[PDB]
Amino acid sequence: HLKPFPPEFLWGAASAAYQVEGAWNEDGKGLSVWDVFAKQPGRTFKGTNGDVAVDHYHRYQEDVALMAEMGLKAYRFSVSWSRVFPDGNGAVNEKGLDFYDRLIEELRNHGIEPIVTLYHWDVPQALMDAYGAWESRRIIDDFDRYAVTLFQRFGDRVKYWVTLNQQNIFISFGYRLGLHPPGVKDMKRMYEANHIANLANAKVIQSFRHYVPDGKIGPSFAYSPMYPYDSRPENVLAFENAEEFQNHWWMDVYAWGMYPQAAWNYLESQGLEPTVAPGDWELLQAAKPDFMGVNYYQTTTVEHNPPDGVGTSSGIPGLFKTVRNPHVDTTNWDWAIDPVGLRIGLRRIANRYQLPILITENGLGEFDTLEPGDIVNDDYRIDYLRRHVQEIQRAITDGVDVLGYCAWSFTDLLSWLNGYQKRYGFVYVNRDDESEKDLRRIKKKSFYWYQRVIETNGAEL
Amino acid sequence: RHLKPFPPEFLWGAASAAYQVEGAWNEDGKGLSVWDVFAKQPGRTFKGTNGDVAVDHYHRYQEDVALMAEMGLKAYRFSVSWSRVFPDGNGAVNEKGLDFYDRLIEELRNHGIEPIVTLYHWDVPQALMDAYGAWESRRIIDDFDRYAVTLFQRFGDRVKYWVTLNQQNIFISFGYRLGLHPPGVKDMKRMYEANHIANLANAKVIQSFRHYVPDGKIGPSFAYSPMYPYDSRPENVLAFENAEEFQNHWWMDVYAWGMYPQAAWNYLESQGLEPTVAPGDWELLQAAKPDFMGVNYYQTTTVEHNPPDGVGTSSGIPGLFKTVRNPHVDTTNWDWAIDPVGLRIGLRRIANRYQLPILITENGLGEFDTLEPGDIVNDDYRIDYLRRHVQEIQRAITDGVDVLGYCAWSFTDLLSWLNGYQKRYGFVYVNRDDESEKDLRRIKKKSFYWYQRVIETNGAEL
Ligand SMILES: O=P(O)(O)OC[C@H]1O[C@@H](O[C@H]2[C@H](O)[C@@H](O)[C@H](O)O[C@@H]2CO)[C@H](O)[C@@H](O)[C@@H]1O
Ligand SMILES: O=P(O)(O)OC[C@H]1O[C@@H](O)[C@H](O)[C@@H](O)[C@@H]1O
């Protein structure tokens, strides 16, 4: 018999500041690296950018009212560092803090738990200009000063905090694939910036223990659990390599403060291991989180990759390469649909680290059709969410401590590079890639489905 | 890719177990072990074979050590028979029993061979079973500790490497779940209680070791079959998660971290099978970190989804996993997988999960060796098996696993627990069979000279 969801389960939904807020130059806000990057011609679909997005900065009262109508138990959002410190360091911007204060008060007045995410990829451009942002150890103290400011202003009202959201994405996309700022393709630089981000995460967790002694904090990891293609020993070995290189490389640092040794030795043999300073290991080991945040969309299957092989398939020669998994469904965008993979990832985190898990992001991006009468029938989104929630219930029954589930996303939002048409929200926003239209909010069918999930604490899916 | 060499102090070894080699079952004051009694029950063992004589290593140890020195062994791993040292398990120490192990250790040291002493290989004295049920009573924790401390005091000056419980998962599961080994019980609840007591005994002895052998290295040895999923079907990967945790982490997480894994614990709790925990248990288990994980390795196991009405050929646990033949590995003549890459995988998994050095305490090939005219045994099949495993160990070292040594199973042919003598494991053939001891003469197999050359070249010629 499946166990019920625990009574205080945080049924949530989530967003990110650049993707929803707009108001990119209002109330003293400084430029973020994304304000600049997205205005490079050709970088984003149809030149879409975060100047307005879905205008949540001005429409937050309506959006929170919709959350209360749904009965959301928690809303996870990120704070835009450039609103609080327009230059990254230096003078605090009270008008920027005041927006988040008003948002938090609106949530609390409706009984919704805020989950504050410190960082979703939008370091102030001034810090990139001054010292290269995440490539400089200077960012450790600047990020800590920013985080401490938020802990001081909001710790009395916010119990749950996420530090770096998807560090593995912003680091790898920014420094290895060149898809995100700063547009670099250099593995050596990637691992250096990654190490600095690890130190920044640990430093802010240490600060949190002083300023928010009753709070709960953790990083959030974009987790694609690895599978071996089959039981061929060389494919199982490729899986060992891939899970360690892609997943333990981050989560072991978060949980244990140590990089895994086989991956470290491989990077050292390539001259790619990060520079370690005295005190680094002590800091990383002394910053235990209360939970592991998990952003989940799909698993990855791997197979053996000879030393002259792949490096379609991607991988590392001599370690592993990816291969299409014939045993999982796909979305209309070729993302795998693997709800059991979420249960597997949750089981792996509990088994390896004994940590509670907050699922910070999971959802389905698809074209939605607006029908006359302001009707959006998104049964495909209900199907996807239902199947993932069902597997979470099985993970809970197995013994995993899952603190909550934040569906991605509450309203439709701006994609980093792909505009607006692949929508994720429970709430449709009437705008597209060419026009803001009237920006009106329209509840999708999935809104009412999730409302009923919450009312029954997951008993009716 | 440049392979790393075997480290300069790598323990090229071979191994045995006391009941399987010693004989002298009632000599020099030795008391009855549970195996002395069990193997004499009609029908328990093939052709009634038992350890009364075995290969008579108790009397022939000088000849056997001389062969080890001829081979150039760096280490010899053996077990101490508790019933020789404390015939009743507790009570009076038997000095003649200690004197045998003293003579053996001196013989090894005089030939430059490192002794690796194994405290327990399944032979608890029958008197402790009679009095209180042996591993089912917490009384065994202090009795085992007193025995271990006796050995630490007598031999700690000359023995650096110690193994505590050898293959706890086997003696506990075979003794209390499958009923194949003493005490012949089939009761999962009793199995998990005895297993918990064995965990506490292991931790207690490691704590004592820190007091008595401060420069030594100690660890348990686990019979490790690394699990594989059959394929990338999500339900088969989940079956693998269940199987690796339930079959492997259940033991190794206690050894390394002092904690049982939660999903397995909750499953047992739902069946009414979780062990009874006393105040102080977690503190003891957590405060007994080993210096290494010992690994007894023969093969991997591949698993697939098993519905709640499923298998309980294939074996498994309904709702968790079931085994399935792996189509991508060869098998021995007894349907055991031959999977040397699986040894590398298991070594990588232990380093990745626990960051522990590993002593491979047992690995070998059992086969029906033919004694040819001229006292020749051509066991190229054994050479091939060992060569491939040693090659994969070198790759694991190159990956970054700290492997302390490799003990081939076995040095001489020996008595199997239930299956007699015909399926042989030694580098040294022993002339006897299931019907009689013949003359017990020792005959070097071809593999003896192969391993001699491996050791001489520190693994460069395999
Ligand atoms: O509109 P898109 O391109 O589908 O983006 C949706 C969300 O993507 C999340 O990150 C993804 C990323 O898109 C993938 O490229 C990467 O491989 O996986 C990560 C896993 O999260 C972002 O978290 C979110 O801000 C986007 O809305
Ligand atoms: O002869 P069998 O049944 O294959 O057993 C071989 C070996 O099996 C191993 O599990 C034991 O550790 C050894 O003690 C034993 O010799």
Task: Give me a quick take on this structure.
The structure is a homodimer. Chain A is α/β, with parallel strands linked by helices.
Description:
The structure is a homodimer. The first copy, chain A, is of the alpha/beta class and 461 residues long. Chain A has a single domain, classed as Glycosidases (TIM Barrel), CATH 3.20.20.80. Chain A has helices at residues 17-20, 33-38, 56-70, 81-84, 94-109, 125-131, 138-154, 167-175, 187-211, 233-256, 261-269, 280-285, 339-353, 379-398, 445-455, and strands at residues 10-14, 74-78, 113-119, 160-165, 216-222, 226-228, 292-295, 300-303, 315-316, 320-323, 329-330, 336-337, 357-362, 402-408, 427-429, 441-443. In chain A, the strands form 4 sheets. An 8-stranded parallel β-barrel of chain A has the order 1-2-3-4-5-7-13-14, surrounded by 6 helices. In chain A, strands 6-8-10-9 form a 4-stranded mixed sheet. The first copy, chain A, has a two-stranded antiparallel ribbon with strand order 11-12. The longest helix of chain A has 25 residues, at 187-211. Chain A is globular. At the A-B interface, helix 10, helix 11 and helix 13 of A face helix 10, helix 11 and helix 13 of B. Bound molecules: a molecule of 2 linked components (BGC-BG6) and 6-O-phosphono-beta-D-glucopyranose. 6-O-phosphono-beta-D-glucopyranose is lined by residues 17, 20, 167, 170, 296, 362, 366, 416, 419, 423 of chain B. Residues 17, 20, 167, 170, 296, 362, 366, 416, 419, 423 of chain B line the site of 6-O-phosphono-beta-D-glucopyranose. Chain A: Belongs to the glycosyl hydrolase 1 family. Chain A: It is an enzyme of class 3 (hydrolase). Chain A: Beta-D-glucose 6-phosphate 1 binds at residues 19, 120, 166, 361, 408, 415-416, 418, 422, 424.
